């Protein structure tokens, strides 16, 4: 139906934008902004996590247009583990990039000892390792099931099915939305407070222009994260609580809210690389 194509297209565009933006960021980092600074390592990790997250979208896009999962059991475990894995990896990279920018500004003396590129490599690997605390269990449980004459790639839980199914959703709610928002908001909020009292951003008209720019950037990253993830996270919680009748609006909003949580992977390249000051210099060299 036209709506299904529209939903499929909305998932496609989010996929194409996400991959093209993230692969571009990784490309520029590999060749121009080497993975020397801690920031670039996080940017590359965020772009890689974002790219892997959005690589699952074509399979979900096909799994929606034709109403069945034609990619088999093995891929289902991969495409759901990559989804669940790259959500927590993408979120924890943002949480690390927030804490990295917070220690930089609020503990600058300690930041020198901790913000080494080596530590960025460790914390990045630790993000991927910890994100296996959900991706691996999801990989085991992400079995393909036959239902109503069509194949559905989903998660299979243990008895009681309610307990583990909601425990995953609750843990996805706490450690992928609540803990991130508190970290991202508190870290960047405390960051802006320090910046409000720093000599090179206060005491002049033009310096205030820079501070407004940094504050706008900080607000926009928090804002984009809240606008992208909150809709789907609450929608998942409401569905797990009460039965919402399936209508032409409930379906569209649901897929839109999923599309929006994947659009944070589409926007992470722009927010953290294309609007990075270091990248603008080196990106200006990019030939196309």
Ligand X SMILES: CC(C)CCC[C@@H](C)[C@H]1CC[C@H]2[C@@H]3CC=C4C[C@@H](O)CC[C@]4(C)[C@H]3CC[C@]12C
* 284 lies in the binding site for other proteins (CB under 8 A): no
In terms of residues, how long is the chain? 288
Q: Check binding of 178 to ligand X (CB under 6 A).
A: no
CA distance 164 to 235: 19
Taking CB under 6 A as the criterion, the residue among 172, 211, 214, 221 binding ligand EIG is: 172
> Which of 68, 59, 79, 64 is closest to 5 using CA atoms?
64
Residue 279 binds other proteins, judged by CB under 8 A: yes
Part of the chain binding ligand X (CB under 6 A), chosen from 100-108, 188-196, 197-205, 230-238: 230-238
Instruction: Indicate which single residue of 261, 266, 268, 276 sits in contact with ligand EIG (rule: CB under 6 A).
Output: 261
Report whether the peptide linkage leading into residue 160 is cis, meaning its omega lies within 30 degrees of zero.
yes
Q: In the beta sheet, which residues pair with residue 160?
A: none
Q: Measure the N-to-C terminal CA separation of the chain; round to a whole number of Å.
A: 37
69 binds ligand EIG (CB under 6 A): no
Instruction: Decide: 87 and 53 in contact? Cβ < 8 Å.
Output: yes
Give the one residue of 17, 35, 176, 183 binding ligand X; rule: CB under 6 A. 35
User: Scanning the structure block, which residue is given the tokens 């980092």?
Assistant: 29
Interface with ligand EIG (CB under 6 A), residue total 16
Footprint on residues 152-171 left by other proteins (CB under 8 A): none
Question: With contacts defined by CB under 8 A, how many residues of the chain interact with other proteins?
Answer: 33
144 phi, psi to nearest 5 deg: -85, 135
From the list 69-77, 108-116, 238-246, 258-266, the region that binds ligand EIG by CB under 6 A is: 258-266
Nearest residue to 218 (alpha-carbon basis) of 242, 247, 190? 190
Q: Name residues contacting ligand X, limited to 140-159 (CB under 6 A).
A: none
Establish if 219 lies at the interface with other proteins (CB under 8 A): no
- Binding part of the chain for other proteins, among 82-90, 101-109, 125-133, 222-230 by CB under 8 A, reads 101-109
Q: How many helices (H) does the chain have, and how many strands (E)?
A: 12, 2
Q: Angle at Cα 48 formed by Cα 42 and Cα 53, nearest 5°?
A: 125
Residue 200, classified by CB atoms within 10 Å of its CB into exposed (0-12), middle (13-18) or buried (19+), is exposed
Residue 180, Cβ neighbours under 10 Å: how many? 21
Q: Could you say which of 155, 194, 220, 270 contacts other proteins (CB under 8 A)?
A: 194
Whose Cβ is closer to ligand EIG: residue 17's or residue 232's? 232
35 or 79: CB nearest ligand EIG: 79
Identify the sign of the CA torsion 226, 229, 233, 235.
Answer: positive
Residues forming a β-bridge with 137 = none
Q: Where are the beta strands (DSSP E) in the chain?
A: 144-147, 150-153
From 39, 55, 96, 124, residue interacting with ligand X (rule: CB under 6 A) = 124
Footprint on this chain of other proteins (rule: CB under 8 A)? 37-39, 43, 100-101, 104-105, 108-113, 115-116, 118, 194, 198-200, 204, 206-207, 210, 214, 217-218, 272, 276-279
Footprint on this chain of ligand EIG (rule: CB under 6 A)? 11, 57, 60, 64, 80, 83-84, 87, 172, 232-233, 236, 255, 258, 261-262
Footprint on this chain of ligand X (rule: CB under 6 A)? 35, 41, 44-45, 48, 52, 85, 121, 124-125, 128, 226-227, 230-231, 234-235, 238, 244, 250, 253, 257
């Amino acid at each position: 139906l036209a709506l299904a194509i529209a939903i499929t297209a909305l998932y496609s565009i989010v996929c194409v934008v996400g991959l093209f933006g993230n692969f571009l960021v990784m490309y520029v980092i590999v060749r121009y902004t080497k993975m020397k600074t801690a920031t670039n390592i996080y940017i590359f990790n965020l772009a890689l996590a974002d790219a892997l997250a959005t690589s699952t979208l074509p399979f979900q896009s096909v799994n929606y247009l034709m109403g069945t999962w034609p990619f088999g059991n093995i891929l289902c475990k991969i495409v759901i583990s990559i989804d669940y894995y790259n959500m927590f990896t993408s979120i924890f990279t943002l949480c690390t990039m927030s804490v990295d920018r917070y220690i930089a500004v609020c503990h600058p003396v300690k930041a020198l000892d901790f913000r080494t590129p080596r530590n960025a490599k460790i914390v990045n690997v630790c993000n991927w390792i910890l994100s296996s605390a959900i991706g691996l269990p999801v990989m085991f449980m992400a079995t393909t099931k036959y239902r109503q004459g069509s194949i559905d790639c989903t998660l299979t839980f243990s008895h009681p099915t309610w307990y583990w199914e909601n425990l995953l959703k609750i843990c996805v709610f706490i450690f992928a939305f609540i803990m991130p928002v508190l970290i991202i908001t508190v870290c960047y909020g405390l960051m802006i407070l320090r910046l409000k009292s720093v000599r090179m951003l206060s005491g002049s008209k033009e310096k205030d222009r820079n501070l407004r720019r940094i504050t706008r950037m900080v607000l926009v990253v928090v804002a984009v994260f809240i606008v992208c993830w909150t809709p789907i996270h609450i929608y998942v919680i409401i569905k797990a609580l009460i039965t919402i009748p399936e209508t032409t609006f409930q379906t569209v909003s649901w897929h839109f809210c999923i599309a929006l949580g994947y659009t944070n992977s589409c926007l992470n390249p722009v927010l953290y690389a294309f609007l990075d000051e270091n990248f603008k210099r080196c990106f200006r060299e990019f030939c196309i």
